[PDB]
Every structure is written in C-alpha cells, then in structure tokens.
C-alpha cells in the first residue's frame, strides 16, 4: 500500500541525477575547497546553487557529484563508527522509586545530576560550578547499576551505557578513536548522560616493567582524560565512572578535578534493611500480620543482592514444603537457606573489597 | 586565544619566571640572545605530581603572548594504520 | 619461630580460619552419641572405602581420657592427636595439683579453652577437629555429654551428632528421642544409636564402633559380633513396620 | 540492503535467510534424551526443574505469584555425577532454544576479541525464543600453560567482567537463562556469579548402594545380560564410584562380549570390567584423610 | 510495547486520555484473574457475553463514530464469569485437595483452579466446580 504513493513522486527522484553523490571529507577552505575522497583522491570544488557559504566547515563530510564534482548537501561528521549507535538505550525499566532506603546514596546523586538538568537556574544565583563527574563504586551486589538507570528515567533524555571492555578493540590505537565517539555526541546531543561500567579493566598506571603488553590499555585513560579535561576545558554533560575495584584504579583517576561528588555504597543497617523488604512487600504475597523487621534482623549484614533473594526463594517453598503463600515459617527456613545455606564459598558480599 | 591568563594563579611566581625564559622570551628577546652567543632552548619537560598539573598555565602561555598555538595530543598519535600516526 | 598471624577477621565479622576449618569436620566420619539415665553411649563409624584393616591393631576411634570419661571426636585426625595427649596429661596434672579426680565439666572447658588459645595465638592454626566428651563425674551418676566445637564454644546436649550427614541425624533424634523421658536401660540406649547409623553407614558392620560408658569407671566396648546383634533386631522391626 | 545499478538507489532491505549467521549455535535438533536415563538423581533433578523448566513450561505460576524467576543455577561437584546430562534432559521437554558452549572458547588469541565474542553470544540467543545460555566445564583463566592464545593479565579482566555485565547491565524480560557448571568453581572469580541473579545452588555427591541399583538398571535396560549376572551383586562390589564409573563398567563389559560376539553378556565380562575401571579410570584422590 | 505507542494521539484529540485508558482498565477487570469467554467444558454458548462485547464494539465513547453517550460501555460488567472450584463435605467444612495452578499449590474450598483434576475421590466425575468429597472406610485420606 505505501509503495504506490511513493512511486508517483519517484519520477524526479530516480530518473534525474541528484542522489548519486560521492561523499568525502573537506580539508582546506579558501574564501577553492580541497577535499579527499574515500579512494584517496584530492580535488578542488566550490559552493553550489542552494549551498550556503557558512554551512561548509573544516573536517566535515560533504557529498559531491561523481561526474562533475560540486558541493550539493552537507552531512554530519563522524559517519564511520557504527558502534555507538547501539550504545544509546531508551526508557529503562527501572524507575526512580525502585531504589529502596532513605539513606544518603539517593539524594546526593540527584542534586549533582538531576538538579542542574531540571533547574539550571537554581545554582546560577550563587554563581557556582556544578560537579562534572561523580564517583560510584561500592561493594559488589548492592545494585549500583540499578541506581544509574533510575537517574535516566527522571532525566527523560539520551542515556549512554559504556562497558569497560568495549573501549578496548582488536587493533592498537583504535581504542583512542572509541573515546572521541562518546564525547562527539555530547556536543551534538546536549543534556545527555554517559555511564562507564567496569573501569578497572581500563584504568590504572601499571607502569612499564610488567608483562609489556599493558601499554595499550593505559593509553585509553590518557585519551579519556584528555577528552574529559584537556588543554581546552570542553565539556557539557555528566560523566559517571563505576567499577567494583576502586583500589586498582589510577591514583590520578582517584583524585578530584575530573570528579567532585564521591559516594560509596554501604550495607544497610537494621533500619536500612527493613525498607529493602518493604519495597518488595508490595509485590509477591505477604501474609497479614508478619513483621519484616525480625527477618532482616536475623539476617546478618549483606549486600542487596542477597536481600532480594529472601523474597524470591520464599515463593519456592510454596511447592515442596506444602504451603499456599509465603508464611512466617517459610521465612525462618529461608534464613538457614538463603543466607546460612548459601554462604559456603564463592559468596562475595564484603569478601573482596580490594583485589 | 583562550580565556585563561596569569591573573588566575598565585604563589606560583617561583616557577612562572622559569617558563617565561623558555617559550616566551625567545619570541621577543631572541634578537638579544644572538648577541650573547647562546641559543634558545628547543623545549622544556613539563611534569608534576599524579594530578592536574601546570596545564592551567599552559593556556596563559598561548594567551598573553598572543602567538600561534598548536595542540598535539600524545594518545591521539597511535592508530591502527601504520605511518598515519607518524605523518 | 613463626610469628605471623593467621586468623583474621573477615569484613563480614567472621574469621576465615574458623569457618573454613569447620568444613573438615563435615567431610569426616560422622560421630553420634546419646545419653540415658544410668548410661551413656557414644557411636562412631569408620571409612568404608579402605579395606584390609585389622581392628585389633588399629587404634580405637574413641579415645579414653580417664577411667570414667572418654573422648570420641570427628574431624582432622592430624589435629586430634594433639588434643588427646594434652587432655590426658592434664588429667594426671589435675590429680597432682588438686589431688582430685577430673570432672567432665572441667575436661570440656579445658579442651575448649586450649582451642581458644591457638585461635588467639599468632603463628598457629585452630584445630580442624570437633571432640565429644562424655562420662560421669566422681560420686555422681548424672550423665554428662558435652560438645566441643573447633571455634571454642562448648555446650551440653542430650543427643547430638557431628560430621557428614549431621543435619539428617539431628532431625531424626529430635522426633524419635525425647529429652524429657530418656531411657533408663542400657539396651535401649544402644539400639537408639544404631538407628541413627542406618542412614549414614548404609548397611555395614566392621565400620561401626560403639562405646558404652557406665558409671563407677566401667567401660564395656561392644565387639563386632555384639554390634551386629542389635542391628538384626532393629532391621526386623523396620521393614515390617 | 539492495542498491541499484544506474541510479544507485536503495531498492530495499535484504533479510538474512538460512539460519542466523553462525550455525554452530547448537540449535538442538532434539535427540530426545529423557529423564529415565538420569534417574536415581531425582532428589536433585526436581531442584533444577522448578527454577528452569517450570517458568518456561508453566509461566503462570511465577507471574501470578509476583516473584521474579531466577536466571539459572550454578552446579558444583566431583566429575562423574552427571552434571552434563542434567541440563540436557531439561531442554528436551521445554522444546525451546538451548545453547552449549565450552568454557575454553571465551578467550581468543587476538587481544580484544574475547569480550567481543561474549557480546554476540547473548545478543543472538536473546533475539530468537526464550533461549538458555549454558556454558559447561569452565577452565577459563586458570592454570594457564598457554603459549599461543595467552593475552596477559588484560584479557583476564575484560573477558570475565563482560559476562558479569550481561547478567547486570544487559536488560532482559526474564526469557534468558544462564546456567554454569564445571568441576571446580572456586578458581573462578566469585564476583562473576553475583548471586542476586542466581538464587539456586545445587551440589553433588557420590551415590549410595540404593541409588547405584537404579543407575545400573538404566544402562542394562537395553543391554542383554545372562542369567548368572546379578544386579545387586555388581552394586555391592562398587566402592567410591560416580555415575560415569557405572556406565564405564557397562561399556567395558559390552566391549568384552563384542570381541567374542555374544548377545547376552556373561558374568566373566563384569569381573574383568570392574578390575580395569578401578585400576586406570578410577585413581585415588588427593584428599587422603582417614 | 503496543500500549506505549498511543501517546502520539493525545495532541490530536483531547479525549484520547480516556479512550486509550478505557480499554486498558477493561483488560485488568477482575484484578487480572477474570475474563470473558463464551465457551466452556460443556460447550454452552452464552448470549449475555455476546450482548456486551458486540454492542460495545461500535460507539464505545461519545466522539467515536457518530454522536453517542457515555452509558454505552457499562454493559460489559454483566458478562463477568470468574473461574473457581469448591469442595465441601456436609455442613460446608473445607477439605484440602491437591491442585497446582497460578495464584496456588494444594488448594481447598475457597480458591480457584484452571483445567486440572486432583487425585482425591469426590463422587463420580471428579470435575471442577462445587463437589463433595467422600472417602471409603478402607482407604480414607482427609484434611
């Protein structure tokens, strides 16, 4: 059906020669334009009929006709990378209210990120500088990645999630181009959010005398630091560094001036772990008259990953243990099962804080 | 020219006079340097603690002098194509 | 000698040298025992994989610390010889210093107290074996059964087991045995231990060793033919019921 | 896409046919391996069935309950307990997509291609059907002794943490299941597990004399045995053996009768089979205590 | 994904806020555990359901099709047929049966089930609905 309407206007856009343009990047601007093709061929051209003199800029892809080369339409630069097109997500499922607890790991993030985006004129009265970067590391298993998605929901803008292993490519030097791919969209798309995940595989000095193949990774941060704070302080959006190993990072990366707000996650206390089961109490099945403060009290200090496992495994006892819904008896069985039974080995929580 | 000048720093005058004698004075007094028989320094190593560093004053060198500045990033000089980083 | 510390508090608050040492007991032979009014019975198994082991020349799994009290452990056999020798020397040292026969309460707190030293002593490692001390105090017929954990915590139990498949036997001793009405005869105390060994030994004879503890410094060790006598009577009332 | 010759205009999009590119994806032609052959493990068989097969076969139980179903289960135990056949029988009744990946393929020779492979494994499997990613026998990054494909200590952090982000940073509706099993999981990085995704942990031990009687009857169901061969006698002679050692004696006994071309295996073949397994195939473990 | 693509119609029509959310609430009618079907195990065509959905198809709201009123779509509340199963004895004492369905597992009088039969003996057919369980003096298994 839609193909019939497009065939009517397809007479001028097909038979005539317009679209068959050869796209290439412009080099020198004389106000004669020296442009190098993809086949490595240099030539000279000039403006067109409807082409504006202010549209042509240095280092921009400009399509020209293949027969007689002339400028026709400008194109946005950096057309080669296809990787960063899939790095932008849309509408994350985790909401802002999914993060439990009244502690300080919530309010501190929204003031340095969501506050300048929603109300940029609030800090303009005092004439201060909002923090460009932030710091979130914490112990493994607290759902730190869930807090990054909760910010993207309230922001209602472009979000970029970057994996630490994605920056390292299969060639030496290609990782340097991967850094500018992220910061190029910062100027193109204003008021977005970039997020780095597992930076420990990237950062750190690591010096020289080691295995010797380590000099390729250390240049990624030196390219990332240069693109963050260089000779020219070029930056707009907020930068988020996150990993599970803060001690193995670059001691320069661990110092301010690229980062101001620093928040480290901690294990919720008896009052903190209570709200963890309250946000899950609205879900599943909760028997009327059951106090969740006694369950979190019998459970020792542990990450939120093992806290949500209590409510999930409690529903598993409805089959083998011959129960309708989750009762208080099944909650006590989960204490020796979800916690005491699963300790053994290979249980992280606070086990690995360093290496 | 950038927006950073020497008026935004303080207490650094000990190391400021040394940077003026490297990339600053030979842009002016080089005619007087040939009379003494010496030669202008072809470069100076710039380093510091594992931190920000003196890059704040690097902008003032390209500002107050009002000369031509060329920014060259070292990590941008390594590429997969052999010889392109050397050119 | 070696001055470097070993036990270190985990960030969770526990100790690695403790919890990892408890796994050596769970991988060892299960040691179960019960106590009656006039008698105490301590059962123990052996390794069913190894054969051609003469019972006479092999040291008994239940070590006798004193005439009125014995020790049946489960765990590392390398760390058990240290506790058995030092408990017997203190048994004679207590008779030398205070001129008093030792008591089951003093023997348990001593062995558990010595284990507290190695956990707190830099340069040594805790014991990976758990001992069960059962006996009768002098001029007292009251049964005494005390558990000694590798962590140093000791407690009294009516019926308690340690080693592999412990949780299976513990659930069996709660419903079948009652602490309010213990058996007043020796024969009922022996048959109770055999019922707990049917789910672990799994149809074996020479691998079962049962030690009977009686007051007035009376110890009677059941032979191979005497243990199988109680097994036959229970198996006839098991499948038929 | 599809271009044009003269006008050089896009004609349309051309979809990829004849399977989604790489065909080694283990599409599972379904040989139909049932649960009767893995019988005797039913104590631990119903454990994985509820956390894997149950949400796929009966999704209404977890949806109406309100709890989130687990993303898989980790397996640990001595070799020979049947950890390979446990996950094979689950994918048979589900009739869904299921994957089998060797843990040694996570690291390549070229630097940077290790984490690039782990991205394409979960990407293609998640697009078609509620698939399951099962990586068996993971030796990755330990006791290296690798001259060729060794990438240093940089391949260690990139390849492993890439799998952790697939269970954390990668969003999914719950149709992707990840089950990992190997001989020893202690050498692996425990941070890779992150047991807020995996709430199920299944261990394995050696079977008793009652379980081996059921396992022996499985392999001898299709085998022709003579009248002088007793099933309970062979189980009694079994000492410290796993599920694989039971099939090893059934295979060795079949090879002895195959040399003489005997339909029914006599009792003399089982006598020589148990002696060869306990000698070579069965080696004394380094445990050594007691 | 389908219900979230209708946000572009709120600008073209001021009443699109109620229209897009009217059928969504009808989908959740009965706390999500209830539905409307004209078929059952006995194959009985019910004209009450056919007198509701078919009538509310055309002219759902006032701006839809010609000029209508807001009382037309209330006919769907009369065709609600919730699924349930009940088991009694004499005076109404409940008896536990074995049924595994979605919420649950091993239910009794006062819960619901879908296409399942228990192992307990009621009288003859052993079907869903309201039944009475009676046991023989030889083998008797009750709550």
From Swiss-Prot, chain A:
Modified residues (Phosphoserine): 52, 119
Annotated coiled-coil segments of the chain: none
Residues the record lists as binding ATP: 138-145
Cell location: Cytoplasm; Nucleus
Function: The 26S proteasome is involved in the ATP-dependent degradation of ubiquitinated proteins. The regulatory (or ATPase) complex confers ATP dependency and substrate specificity to the 26S complex.
Sequence similarity: Belongs to the AAA ATPase family.
Name of the protein in question: 26S proteasome regulatory subunit 7 homolog
Full-protein interval shown: 77 to 467 of 467
Curated annotation (Swiss-Prot), chain B:
The protein's role, per its UniProt record: The 26S proteasome is involved in the ATP-dependent degradation of ubiquitinated proteins. The regulatory (or ATPase) complex confers ATP dependency and substrate specificity to the 26S complex.
A GO biological process held by the record: proteasome-mediated ubiquitin-dependent protein catabolic process
Similarity comment text for this entry: Belongs to the AAA ATPase family.
Source lineage: Eukaryota, Fungi, Dikarya, Ascomycota, Saccharomycotina
Coverage span on the entire protein: 175 to 261 of 434
Gene (name only): RPT5
Residues bound to ATP: 48-55
Organism: Saccharomyces cerevisiae (strain ATCC 204508 / S288c)
Residue numbers carrying Phosphotyrosine: 6
Name this polypeptide is given: 26S proteasome regulatory subunit 6A
Processing after translation: N-acetylated by NAT1.
UniProtKB/Swiss-Prot annotation, chain C:
InterPro entries recorded: Ntn_hydrolases_N (IPR029055), Proteasome_alpha (IPR050115), Proteasome_alpha-type (IPR023332), Proteasome_asu_N (IPR000426), Proteasome_bsu_CS (IPR016050), Proteasome_sua/b (IPR001353)
Source taxon at top rank: Eukaryota
The keyword Phosphoprotein appears for this protein: yes
Keywords recorded for this protein, A-Z: Cytoplasm, Nucleus, Phosphoprotein, Proteasome
Principal location class: cytoplasm
Localization per record: Cytoplasm; Nucleus
Modified residue annotations for Phosphothreonine: 58
Pfam families xrefs: Proteasome (PF00227), Proteasome_A_N (PF10584)
Miscellaneous: Present with 16800 molecules/cell in log phase SD medium.
Protein name per its UniProtKB record: Proteasome subunit alpha type-4
Species whose genome carries this gene: Saccharomyces cerevisiae (strain ATCC 204508 / S288c) (Baker's yeast)
UniProtKB/Swiss-Prot annotation, chain D:
Glycyl lysine isopeptide (Lys-Gly) (interchain with G-Cter in ubiquitin) crosslink residues: 88, 109, 144
GO cellular component, one term: proteasome complex
Domain of life: Eukaryota
ATP-binding listed as a keyword: yes
Keyword Lipoprotein recorded: yes
Primary site of residence: cytoplasm
The entry's keywords: ATP-binding, Cytoplasm, Isopeptide bond, Lipoprotein, Myristate, Nucleotide-binding, Nucleus, Proteasome, Ubl conjugation
Location(s), subcellular: Cytoplasm; Nucleus
Record GO biological process: nonfunctional rRNA decay; peptide catabolic process; positive regulation of protein catabolic process; proteasome regulatory particle assembly; proteasome-mediated ubiquitin-dependent protein catabolic process; protein-containing complex localization; ubiquitin-dependent protein catabolic process
MF annotations from Gene Ontology: ATP binding; ATP hydrolysis activity; proteasome-activating activity
Disulfide bonds: none
Binding site for ATP: 77-84
Function: The 26S proteasome is involved in the ATP-dependent degradation of ubiquitinated proteins. The regulatory (or ATPase) complex confers ATP dependency and substrate specificity to the 26S complex. Has ATPase activity.
Family affiliation: Belongs to the AAA ATPase family.
Protein name (Swiss-Prot/TrEMBL): 26S proteasome regulatory subunit 4 homolog
Taxonomic placement: Eukaryota, Fungi, Dikarya, Ascomycota, Saccharomycotina
Gene symbol of the encoding locus: RPT2
Residues of the whole record sequence present: 147 to 436 of 437
């Amino acid at each position: 059906a839609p193909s019939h309407l497009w065939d009517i206007m397809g007479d001028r856009q097909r038979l005539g020669e317009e679209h068959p343009l050869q796209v290439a990047r412009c080099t020198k601007i004389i106000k004669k334009y020296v442009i190098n093709l993809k086949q490595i061929a240099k030539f000279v051209v000039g403006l067109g009929e409807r082409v504006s003199p202010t549209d042509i800029e240095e280092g921009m892809r400009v399509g020209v006709d293949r027969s007689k080369y002339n400028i026709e339409l400008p194109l946005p630069p950096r057309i080669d990378p296809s990787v960063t097109m899939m790095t932008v997500e849309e509408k994350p499922d985790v909401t802002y209210s999914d993060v439990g607890g009244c502690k300080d790991q919530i309010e501190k993030l929204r003031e340095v990120v969501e506050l300048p985006l929603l109300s940029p004129e609030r800090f303009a009265t005092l004439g201060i500088d909002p923090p460009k970067g932030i710091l979130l590391y914490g112990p493994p298993g607290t759902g730190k990645t869930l807090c990054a998605r909760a910010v993207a929901n309230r922001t209602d803008a472009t979000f970029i999630r970057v994996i630490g292993s994605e920056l390292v490519q299969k060639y030496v030097g290609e990782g340097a181009r991967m850094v500018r791919e992220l910061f190029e969209m910062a100027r193109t798309k204003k008021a977005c959010i970039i997020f780095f995940d597992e930076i420990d595989a990237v950062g750190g000095a690591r010096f020289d005398d080691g295995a010797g193949g380590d000099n390729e990774v250390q240049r990624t941060m030196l390219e990332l630091i240069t693109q963050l704070d260089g000779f020219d302080p070029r930056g707009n959006i907020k930068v988020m560094f996150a990993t599970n190993r803060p001690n193995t990072l670059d001691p320069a990366l661990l110092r301010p001036g690229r980062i101001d707000r620093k928040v480290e996650f901690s294990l919720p206390d008896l009052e903190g772990r209570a709200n963890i089961f309250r946000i899950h109490s609205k879900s599943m099945s909760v028997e009327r008259g059951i106090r969740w403060e006694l369950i979190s009290r019998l459970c020792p200090n542990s990450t939120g990953a093992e806290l949500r496992s209590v409510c999930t495994e409690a529903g598993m006892f409805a089959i083998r243990a011959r129960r309708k819904v989750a009762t208080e008896k099944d909650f006590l069985k989960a204490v020796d099962k979800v916690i005491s039974g699963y300790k053994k080995f290979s249980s992280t929580s606070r086990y690995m804080q360093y290496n | 020219k950038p927006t950073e000048t020497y008026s935004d720093v303080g207490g650094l005058d000990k190391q400021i006079e040394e940077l003026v004698e490297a990339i600053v004075l030979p842009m002016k007094r080089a005619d007087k340097f040939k009379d003494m028989g010496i030669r202008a320094p072809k470069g100076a190593l710039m380093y510091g603690p594992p931190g920000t560093g003196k890059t704040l004053l690097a902008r003032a060198c390209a500002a107050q002098t009002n000369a031509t500045f060329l920014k060259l990033a070292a990590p941008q000089l390594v590429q997969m194509y052999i010889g392109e980083g050397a050119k | 000698g070696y001055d470097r510390a070993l036990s270190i508090f985990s960030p969770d608050g526990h100790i690695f040298q403790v919890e990892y040492a408890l796994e050596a007991v769970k991988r060892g032979t299960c040691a179960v025992g019960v106590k009656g009014k006039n008698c105490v019975v301590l059962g123990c198994e052996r390794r069913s994989t190894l054969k051609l082991q003469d019972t006479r020349i092999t040291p008994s799994k239940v070590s006798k610390i004193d005439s009125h009290v014995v020790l049946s452990f489960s765990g590392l056999n390398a760390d058990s010889r240290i506790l058995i020798e030092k408990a017997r020397v203190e048994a004679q040292s207590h008779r030398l210093t205070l001129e008093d026969p030792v008591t089951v309460e003093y023997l348990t707190r001593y062995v558990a107290g010595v284990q507290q030293r190695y956990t707190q002593s830099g340069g040594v490692r805790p014991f990976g074996v758990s001992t069960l001390i059962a006996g009768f105090d002098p001029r007292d017929d009251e049964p005494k059964l005390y558990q000694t954990e590798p962590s140093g915590i000791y407690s009294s139990w009516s019926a308690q087991t340690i080693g592999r498949n412990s949780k299976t036997v513990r659930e069996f001793l709660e419903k079948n045995y009652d602490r309010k009405e213990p058996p007043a005869t020796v024969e009922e105390c022996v048959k109770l231990t055999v019922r707990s060994l049917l789910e672990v030994v799994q149809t074996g004879a020479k691998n079962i060793e049962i030690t009977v503890v009686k007051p007035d410094s009376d110890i009677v060790a059941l032979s191979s033919e005497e243990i199988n006598q109680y097994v036959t009577q229970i198996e006839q009332e098991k499948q038929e019921q | 896409v599809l271009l044009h010759h003269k006008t050089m205009s896009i004609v349309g999009v051309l979809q990829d046919d004849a399977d989604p590119m790489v065909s080694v994806m283990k599409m599972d032609k379904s040989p139909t391996e049932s649960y009767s052959d893995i019988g005797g493990l039913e104590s631990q068989i119903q454990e994985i069935k509820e956390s894997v097969e149950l949400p796929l076969t009966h999704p209404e139980l977890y949806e109406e309950m309100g709890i989130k179903p687990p993303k898989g289960v980790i397996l640990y135990g001595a070799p020979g307990t049947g950890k390979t056949l446990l996950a094979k029988a689950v994918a048979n009744q589900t009739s869904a997509t299921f994957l089998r990946i060797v843990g040694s393929e996570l690291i390549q020779k070229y630097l940077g291609d290790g984490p690039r492979l782990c991205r394409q494994i979960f990407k293609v499997a998640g697009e078609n059907a509620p698939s399951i990613v099962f990586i068996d026998e993971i030796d990755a990054i330990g006791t290296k002794r690798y001259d060729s494909n060794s990438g240093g200590e940089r391949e260690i952090q990139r390849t492993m943490l890439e799998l952790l982000n697939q269970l954390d940073g990668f969003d999914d509706r719950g149709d992707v299941k990840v089950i990992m099993a190997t001989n020893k999981i202690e050498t692996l990085d425990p941070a890779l597990i992150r047991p807020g995704r995996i709430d199920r942990k299944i261990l394995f031990e050696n079977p008793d004399l009652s379980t081996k009687k059921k396992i022996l009857g499985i392999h001898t169901s299709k085998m022709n045995l003579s009248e002088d061969v007793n099933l309970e006698t062979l189980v009694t002679t079994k000492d410290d053996l796993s599920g694989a050692d039971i099939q090893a004696m059934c295979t060795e006994a079949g090879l002895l009768a195959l040399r003489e071309r005997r339909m029914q295996v006599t009792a003399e073949d089982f006598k020589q089979a148990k002696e060869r397994v306990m000698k070579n195939k069965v080696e004394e473990n380094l445990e050594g205590l007691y | 994904q389908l219900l979230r693509q209708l946000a572009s119609y709120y600008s073209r029509e001021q009443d699109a806020l109620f229209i897009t959310r009217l059928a969504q609430g009808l989908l959740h009618l009965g706390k999500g555990t209830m539905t409307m079907d004209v078929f059952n195990d006995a194959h009985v065509l019910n004209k009450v359901t056919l007198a509701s959905i078919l009538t509310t198809a055309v002219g759902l709201v006032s701006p839809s099709f010609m000029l209508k009123h807001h009382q037309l779509f209330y006919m769907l509340n009369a065709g609600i047929r919730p699924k349930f199963i009940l088991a009694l004895n004499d005076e109404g004492e409940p008896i536990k049966v074995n049924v595994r369905v979605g919420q649950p597992v091993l239910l009794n009088h006062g819960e619901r089930a879908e296409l399942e039969t228990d192992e307990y003996i009621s009288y003859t057919s052993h079907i869903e609905g309201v039944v009475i369980l009676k046991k023989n003096p030889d083998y008797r298994e009750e709550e």
